[PDB]
Amino acid sequence: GSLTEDGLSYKEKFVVRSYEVGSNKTATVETIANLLQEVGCNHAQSVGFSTDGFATTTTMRKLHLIWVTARMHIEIYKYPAWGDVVEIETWCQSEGRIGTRRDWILKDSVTGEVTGRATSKWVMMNQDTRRLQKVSDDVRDEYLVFCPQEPRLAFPEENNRSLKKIPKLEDPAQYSMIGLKPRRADLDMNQHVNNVTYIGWVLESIPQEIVDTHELQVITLDYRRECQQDDVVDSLTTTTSNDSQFLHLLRLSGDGQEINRGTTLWRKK
Amino acid sequence: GSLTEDGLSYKEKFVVRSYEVGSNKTATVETIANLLQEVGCNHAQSVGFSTDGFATTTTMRKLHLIWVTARMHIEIYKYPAWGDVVEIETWCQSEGRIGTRRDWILKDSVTGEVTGRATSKWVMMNQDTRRLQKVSDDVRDEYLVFCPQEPRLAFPEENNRSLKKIPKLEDPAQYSMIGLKPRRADLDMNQHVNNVTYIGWVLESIPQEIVDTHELQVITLDYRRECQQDDVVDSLTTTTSDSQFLHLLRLSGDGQEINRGTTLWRKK
Ligand SMILES: NCc1noc(-c2ccccc2F)n1
Ligand SMILES: NCc1noc(-c2ccccc2F)n1
């Protein structure tokens, strides 16, 4: 991959691998999410920021500050088949003091048609204390020369699903998968659970008959709290709905501490 | 990637990704194992065999026959760092009626130095009845024009590590990780548990202090029986010593064996 001509975005091509595809012989949403974070990292690398998933400045490193994902929103129109080449363009934009947005556009490299889009909200957190804080002006300005100054949105539309509030699933859940635990392959280089793992865990409580008769069009996931290496997760799903829609909750298997909530939208094949 | 000049081997380059590396910022043995499987598939594709992990002929398809892994053996001298290019060359060779071998050599693209090698034994199985059978002469012949005729071994040395018998760990195990279950991401396109998942499960009962102060040099893993989508696995490890370990995977209920193995680790 490379920075584009204006230096304000980053593009990379990926060949979908045998082990990245599901029963449809196309890429899983987890492979897609992995590729989003790969191009995100390579973009950080390309302009001198940290390449540990946190994309930090020297200023932030001095202060033990990191970026953490608050929300992921992914919309897929066609999943790339095994052997197919998918092109991903990615950029960031500050949303003032709240935090920053990273957005992506996925294309068929052959036709150049848009096959998916994603957006994510990130917030600044002290690494050690876990306390959020508004982005300081010194730090803001470090990033602004790497971001477009005119609004550029993967999700322009006035009211769009990427910004909707997600309610809290009430017991009893229609469906559950109990006792989920991360293994070493679920951890990043920092030994923190990889954000994509939580997508896997959300989808584990979707009944197999849905997965066999539907394709995932939209997923929205909020991140509240991280699952530690030694934590155990319960995944909860309730039907809310030709389209199928679900409300989702991840919570710690003991005390029921919320770690994530989300929605998915599925369309008959 | 591409078949090489003589058409009897296949080569591919891989850029190591951010999410593919562990705490040392180098590729995990599971990332390596996945790339072995990927070049294997691309080699099958390049000469017209099935691309579903089974590399079947049209004959085998009529008979509902598949190739199944009996043994994986992997030796790594240097794990590629994030952003590094690793080149993997791969080839198959018939071992008569017993089955076939796929071998790999891993290189640093920049230096051309060997950074690891792997070998695997495959047996022929009826996919419905799960009965083994020796390889048909008509099936042998279909594969011989795509394999070297002169012996070509990742592990040439008589009685090397890759051919040793693995004994059955006896209770009580020194270390365990219990109640392991596959998720949808551990399944392939056939909805069978991916072979690399059993590698992750073996290593889950290595103490963290070992992983933190050692690098994995050798893994040998026998595959005896499949974990189904809805099965639950216990992972057992005992120190047999460099650090060495004996490994056993078995179903959480009745203690049916699915895998046994060994690992060898060196202090950093
Ligand atoms: N707006 C805040 C911001 N946060 O990251 C970035 C960023 C920009 C370009 C390349 C990598 C990057 F991480 N900007
Ligand atoms: N010896 C039996 C055998 N089994 O696979 C092969 C094989 C050869 C070349 C390319 C792909 C292949 F799968 N041969």
- Measured from the CB, is residue A8 less than 6 Å from ligand 1? no
Amino acid of residue B2 = S
Q: Is residue A71 within 8 Å of A29, Cβ to Cβ? A: no
Q: What spacing in Å lies between the alpha carbon of B40 and ligand 2's midpoint?
A: 9
Pair B19, A184: CB distance under 8 Å:
no
CB neighbours of residue A191 within 10 Å: 14
Inter-chain touch A82–B51, beta carbons under 8 Å:
yes
Tell me the residue ranges of DSSP E strands in chain B. Answer: 2-3, 10-15, 65-76, 85-94, 100-108, 114-126, 175-180, 214-223, 233-239, 243-251, 257-267
Helix (H, G, I), strand (E, B) or coil at A87: strand
Q: Which experimental technique did the depositors report for determining this structure?
A: X-ray
* Helices A195-203 & A29-46 angle (0-180, nearest 10): 170
**CATH classification number, A2-163, choose in 3.10.129.10, 3.40.50.10680, 3.40.50.620, 3.40.50.2300:** 3.10.129.10
Preceding omega of B207 cis (within 30 degrees of 0) = no
Going by the DSSP 8-state scheme, the letter that residue B201 receives in this structure is H
- Residue in the structure block whose two tokens are 């060779």: B93
Nearest ligand (C-alpha, residue A52) = 1
Chain B residues with beta carbon closer than 8 angstroms to that of A83: 45
What's the CATH code, domain B175-267?
Answer: 3.10.129.10
Q: What is the spatial distance between Cα A119 and Cα A106, in angstroms, rounded to a whole number?
A: 12
DSSP B34-79: HHHHHHHHHHHHHTT--SSSS---HHHHHTTEEEEEEEEEEEESSP
Q: How deeply is B212 buried, as exposed, middle or buried, from its count of CB atoms within 10 A (0-12, 13-18, 19+)?
A: exposed
- Counting Cβ atoms within 10 Å, is residue B2 exposed (0-12), middle (13-18) or buried (19+)? exposed
- Residue of B9, B143, B145, B152 to mutate, ligand 2, most atoms within 8 A of C-beta: B143
DSSP 8-state code for residue B132: B
Alpha-helical segments (H) within B128-191: 137-144
Q: Which residues contact B110 (CB under 8 A, 6 or more apart)?
A: B84, B85
For A250-268, b/e burial (b = at least 16 CB within 10 A) is bbbeeeeeebbbbbbbbee
Q: Which two tokens stand for residue A31?
A: 């492979």
d(CA B6, CA B47): 13
B221-236 burial string, b = 16+ CB within 10 Å, else e? bbbeeebeeebebbbb
Across the interface, whether the CB atoms of A38 and B17 are under 8 A apart is answered: yes
Fold equal for A2-163 and A175-268: yes
Give the other-Cβ count within 10 Å of B249's Cβ: 26
Unique residue bearing structure tokens 């399944």 = B187
Whether A190 is a known active-site residue: answer: yes
Distance from CA of B159 to the nearest CA of A (A): 33
Catalytic one of A43, A194, A214, A227: A227
CB B195 within 8 Å of CB B256: no
Rounded CA-CA distance B195/B37 in Å is 9
Are the Cβ atoms of B18 and A53 closer than 8 angstroms? yes
Residues of B labelled catalytic: 190, 192, 227
Q: Does domain A175-268 have CATH number 3.10.129.10?
A: yes
> Which of A115, A103, A112 is closest to A76 using CA atoms?
A115
Q: Would you call A183 and B201 a contact, using CB atoms and an 8 Å cutoff?
A: yes
Domain ranges of chain A: 2-163, 175-268
A193 phi and psi angles, rounded to 5 deg = -65, 130
* CA distance linking residue B214 with residue A136, whole number of Å: 41
